Swiss-Prot record:
Organism, scientific name: Homo sapiens (Human)
Name of the molecule in the record: DNA-dependent protein kinase catalytic subunit
Record PTM N6-acetyllysine, positions in chain: 118
Assembly and oligomerization: DNA-PK is a heterotrimer of PRKDC and the Ku dimer (composed of XRCC6/Ku70 and XRCC5/Ku86). Formation of this complex may be promoted by interaction with ILF3. Component of the core long-range non-homologous end joining (NHEJ) complex (also named DNA-PK complex) composed of PRKDC, LIG4, XRCC4, XRCC6/Ku70, XRCC5/Ku86 and NHEJ1/XLF. Additional component of the NHEJ complex includes PAXX. Following autophosphorylation, PRKDC dissociates from DNA. Interacts with DNA-PKcs-interacting protein (KIP) with the region upstream the kinase domain.
Modified residues (Phosphothreonine): 394
């Protein structure tokens, strides 16, 4: 009769919301009773938790400690039974747990050592710790660091079991997500100050050093995963990836370009290393995103390079006005924006190269007005109609407008002329 009384108030919640503050306690007391049938009558149970967080903002389960320990029992059973070997609903289960732990936040009282038993699986042949590290990602992606030794166990054994799970290499997603959540852990370490993970960084560097000597392909991708959220570990393996840049011909090469994209601001000169590793050979490749990220690192290394190699650098990048994926051409226009904005050379003339780069900058930036995509050319129009590039008294503008002639574009030049004329109409 309690089950039958459940699936009427489950259907009539629209009646209840003006006086719903009292109809949370009995539903919670129903939820915490282990007489449901099986492992909690999941479908009914998720309907219970959905309708009980329907009235969020009023009558939180904290304020009466009976309600607090009741919700703690719910949280414990949810963290206990989650697995469900059909994979299609596992993500839904983690979604329910994630919503509960992100909405409650008041009776925190979170459990440990069962998480530790979840990821504490030995025998690196089976994925029996995927659940523990994924719920670690659930508990970690918002808040809640592993504050172990208040009632738990020692954190040293905790974290070394965790990096052993990161050392577990038989299946893929286990070490991938483990390295990711370690990166989030280290991000919380660098955000805080009191945490003495200042040997855990040495421990994980030791683990990647021990995996480095015998394995190479998994090493760079777990380095990519830990540098997804953790920059300053790349001071260690900076010369290792610079050494074995080749023989990684694939997406691994993009991973190398990403991890060198992590640290550019804070290297010495960086150019001759890449030039010895024939970086300009692979800048002329055909995959989009490696070209995007190497244009990104060219923008990164830009305002420190000498103007002598910049002339050689500006040769293959002008070959990128004939390709789709407007973000890559957008950054390709951005580097020309900066090089014109600060390398116009107002009567310096240290070379023909130092003004020749400004000449080619003017050439490709003016030619970039007839591209077959809107928006970007609107931004170019805003950049040229920006103040103190074409003056704006009235006719200083007119005696200026002929100078941006560029006979590669003349088909639309008169339309652009009246556009830049009567854009300042009043």
């Amino acid at each position: 009769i309690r089950l039958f009384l459940a699936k009427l108030v489950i259907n009539t919640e629209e009646v209840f919301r003006p006086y719903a503050k009292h109809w949370l306690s009995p539903l919670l007391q129903l939820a915490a009773s282990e007489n449901n049938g099986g492992e909690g009558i999941h479908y009914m149970v998720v309907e219970i938790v959905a309708t009980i967080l329907s009235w969020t903002g009023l009558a939180t389960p904290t304020g009466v400690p009976k309600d607090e320990v009741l919700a703690n029992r719910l949280l414990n059973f949810l963290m206990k039974h989650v697995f469900h070997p059909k994979r299609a609903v596992f993500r839904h289960n983690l979604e329910i747990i994630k919503t509960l732990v992100e909405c409650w936040k008041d009776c925190l009282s979170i459990p440990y050592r069962l998480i530790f038993e979840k990821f504490s699986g030995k025998d690196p042949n089976s994925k029996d710790n995927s659940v523990g590290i994924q719920l670690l990602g659930i508990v970690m992606a918002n808040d809640l660091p592993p504050y172990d030794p208040q009632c738990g166990i020692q954190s040293s054994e905790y974290f070394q079991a965790l990096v052993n799970n990161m050392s577990f290499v038989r299946y893929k997603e286990v070490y991938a997500a483990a390295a990711e959540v370690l990166g989030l852990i280290l991000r919380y370490v660098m955000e805080r100050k009191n945490i003495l993970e200042e040997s855990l960084c040495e421990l994980v560097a030791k683990q990647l050093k021990q995996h480095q000597n015998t394995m190479e392909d998994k090493f760079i991708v777990c380095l990519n995963k830990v540098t997804k959220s953790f920059p300053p570990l790349a001071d260690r393996f900076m010369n290792a990836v610079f050494f074995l840049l080749p023989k990684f011909h694939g997406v691994l090469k993009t991973l190398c370009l990403e991890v060198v994209l992590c640290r550019v601001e804070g290297m010495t000169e960086l150019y001759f290393q890449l030039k010895s590793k024939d970086f300009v050979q692979v800048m002329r490749h055909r995959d989009d995103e490696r070209q995007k990220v190497c244009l990104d690192i060219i923008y990164k290394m830009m305002p420190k390079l000498k103007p002598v190699e910049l002339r050689e650098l500006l040769n293959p990048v002008v070959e990128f006005v004939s390709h789709p994926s407007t973000t890559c051409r957008e950054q390709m226009y951005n580097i020309l924006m900066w090089i014109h904005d600060n390398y116009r050379d107002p009567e310096s003339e240290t070379d023909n190269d130092s003004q020749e780069i400004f000449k080619l900058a003017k050439d490709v930036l003016i030619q970039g007005l007839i591209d077959e995509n809107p928006g970007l050319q609107l931004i170019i129009r805003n950049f040229w109609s920006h103040e103190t590039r074409l003056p704006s008294n009235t006719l200083d503008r007119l005696l200026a407008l002929n100078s941006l002639y560029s006979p590669k574009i003349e088909v639309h030049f008169l339309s652009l002329a009246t556009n830049f004329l009567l854009e300042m109409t009043s």
